[PDB]
Design a protein around this ligand. Structure first.
Ligand SMILES: NNC(=S)NCCc1ccc(Cl)cc1
Length: 284
């Protein structure tokens, strides 16, 4: 059912809460036993947000291989995403180890370090060229190369160096800076512009490892980013773009990480972004 019509029908009937709860009821439940081991309590920002064992990213070390991060693999769209929490003071080194090991080109950040007067994630990247960061636990060096500040987002060029082998790579940091402290944006225009800048970079393409995407918990804003991308790609690929069912794509993605899309307002915003983005995808 053409999603724009399904949209006006849910809006006129005011049933966003009822649709959202049906998704929560049908969603997959898989074990997260590694996440709940006592040695990992300080590796988790939230007690109720864990990666499933079957889809979790493993760090390449014999000691403790655990990070709060999941591989979302979309078979028909031919896209992969890593979704992760905002790094903690004791997981900043693990975060950059995962970027290195998975061969990612891009990091997508959808939150500010401080929101609502509290810390939502660690200051995990350098703010001045001349003041580089060293992570001694994972033997990595990170340098700020350049920064381009726009009204809705910032793009940064970083150098990550594996101090063990002296190999270096360029990482792009895409930072969406204007998501409001409460609710969702009124228009999806600046979010869609941001998604098209990430795509243009090559960060989402098969010649690199998966893009790393985060917010505070790595399920809400992060969920919106990957749901919109995948839905617009399927609308480009299929003979009938009106066959794309956003609720079915979201349940497929929830097989790989729990809780993706945290509120009925984030679900409505996801429909709005796909509907509006399609008026470029279909030829404009
Ligand atoms: N416009 N001229 C440039 S960018 N020269 C090279 C500087 C550089 C670039 C990328 C990385 Cl990862 C590290 C260092």
């Amino acid at each position: 059912m053409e999603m724009e019509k399904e949209f006006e029908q849910i809006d006129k009937s005011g049933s966003w809460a009822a649709i959202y709860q049906d998704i929560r009821h049908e969603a997959s439940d898989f074990p997260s036993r590694v996440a709940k081991l006592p040695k990992n309590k300080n590796r988790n920002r939230y007690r109720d947000v864990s990666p499933f064992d079957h889809s979790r990213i493993k760090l390449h070390q014999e000691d403790n291989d655990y990070i709060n991060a999941s591989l979302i693999k979309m078979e028909e769209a031919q896209r992969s995403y890593i979704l992760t929490q905002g790094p903690l003071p004791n997981t900043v080194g693990h975060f950059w180890e995962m970027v290195w090991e998975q061969k990612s080109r891009g990091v997508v950040m959808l939150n500010r370090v401080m929101e609502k007067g509290s810390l939502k994630c660690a200051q995990y990247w350098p703010q001045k060229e001349e003041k580089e960061m060293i992570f001694e636990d994972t033997n990595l060096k990170l340098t700020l190369i350049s920064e381009d500040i726009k009204s809705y987002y910032t793009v940064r060029q970083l150098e990550l160096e594996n101090l063990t082998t002296q190999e270096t790579r360029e990482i792009l940091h895409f930072h969406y800076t204007t998501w409001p402290d409460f609710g969702v944006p009124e228009s999806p225009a600046s979010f869609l512009n941001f998604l098209f800048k990430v795509r243009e970079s090559g960060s989402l393409s098969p010649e690199h490892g998966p893009v790393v995407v985060h917010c505070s918990a790595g399920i809400g804003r992060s969920g919106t980013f990957c749901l919109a991308d995948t839905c617009l790609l399927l609308m480009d690929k299929r003979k009938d773009p009106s066959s794309v069912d956003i609720k079915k794509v979201l349940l497929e993605m929830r097989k790989f990480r729990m809780g993706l899309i945290q509120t009925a307002d984030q679900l409505r915003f996801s429909y709005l972004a796909v509907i509006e983005g399609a008026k470029f995808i279909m030829g404009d």
